[PDB]
Amino acid sequence: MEMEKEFEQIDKSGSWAAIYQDIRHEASDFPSRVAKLPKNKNRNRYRDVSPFDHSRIKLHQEDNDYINASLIKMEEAQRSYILTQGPLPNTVGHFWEMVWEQKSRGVVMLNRVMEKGSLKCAQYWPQKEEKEMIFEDTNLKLTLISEDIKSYYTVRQLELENLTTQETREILHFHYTTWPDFGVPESPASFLNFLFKVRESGSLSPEHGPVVVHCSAGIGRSGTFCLADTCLLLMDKRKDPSSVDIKKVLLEMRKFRMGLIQTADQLRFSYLAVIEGAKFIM
Numbered sequence: 001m002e003m004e005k006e007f008e009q010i011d012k013s014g015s016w017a018a019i020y021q022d023i024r025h026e027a028s029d030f031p032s033r034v035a036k037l038p039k040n041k042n043r044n045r046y047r048d049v050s051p052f053d054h055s056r057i058k059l060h061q062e063d064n065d066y067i068n069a070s071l072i073k074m075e076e077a078q079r080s081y082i083l084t085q086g087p088l089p090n091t092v093g094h095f096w097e098m099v100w101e102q103k104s105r106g107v108v109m110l111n112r113v114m115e116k117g118s119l120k121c122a123q124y125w126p127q128k129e130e131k132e133m134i135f136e137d138t139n140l141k142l143t144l145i146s147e148d149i150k151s152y153y154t155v156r157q158l159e160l161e162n163l164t165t166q167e168t169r170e171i172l173h174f175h176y177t178t179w180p181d182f183g184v185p186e187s188p189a190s191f192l193n194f195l196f197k198v199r200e201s202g203s204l205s206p207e208h209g210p211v212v213v214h215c216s217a218g219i220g221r222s223g224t225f226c227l228a229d230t231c232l233l234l235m236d237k238r239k240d241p242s243s244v245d246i247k248k249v250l251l252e253m254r255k256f257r258m259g260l261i262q263t264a265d266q267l268r269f270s271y272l273a274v275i276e277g278a279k280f281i282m
């Protein structure tokens with residue numbers, strides 16, 4: 001079926017939970033043996049969220065190459081994304097090592113450091129220009145260059161230096177700051193505006209490594225971001241845009257990381273975002 005009318009048909013019939021459970025039943029199951037090794041317990045935020053072995057990002061290190069991060073490679077859309085958990089106190093150096101080694105331009109953050117009164121990820125970037133951060137375990141230096149605070153999101157320019165080689169690179173930090181503590185946003189308008197700002201920066205384009213996207217677990221809000229981006233790109237590429245099937249795209253993405261889209265409300269919000277976004281594109 002088309003999307004917008006499939007949408008109204010699920011609303012009128014109130015069957016979002018049944019649609020979402022079908023997706024969960026059909027989703028791929030692949031091994032995640034490296035994630036579950038005892039030496040990696042303090043590298044995982046949640047025991048039930050792990051990268052598959054076949055698609056995990058490897059650190060360029062011979063001691064321990066593990067990080068909770070996955071490469072999502074979308075062949076028809078010609079887009080790639082790295083989806084990862086919010087960094088932990090003992091993985092902030094690994095996080096920036098990955099950004100460096102994978103040649104990423106942008107980092108997309110969809111959570112606040114504290115939500116619901118608890119810490120959802122480490123404070124992993126500097127908050128003042130004159131107070132830079134040094135990660136001694138991976139030999140990197142990170143400096144805040146500029147910050148632009150808007151009503152729904154903040155964009156930061158960061159300088160990452162590889163201290164071994166003295167090479168430097170500019171990284172863009174796109175921080176969506178207004179996702180509610182409970183539920184999903186009422187309108188997708190600010191989320192779509194944010195997606196378009198990431199696109200306009202070059203961070204999603206083939207001349208760079210894949211964008212790094214995270215929330216707390218790296219599967220819920222993060223899944224919504226890449227699912228919406230890929231669906232809108234396919235609607236532009238194809239002769240028949242009504243042929244784009246958001247459930248089929250989601251199942252393809254779940255071949256590369258488990259659990260993408262965590263609730264039926266997130267599934268409905270993803271439909272809403274793609275539907276509204278397709279009208280603005282034209």
Ligand SMILES: CS(=O)(=O)Nc1ccc(Cl)cc1
Pocket residue numbers: 145157158159160169170171
């Ligand atoms: C103009 S500026 O001060 O050099 N701006 C700047 C500095 C460093 C980086 Cl990585 C990016 C931009």
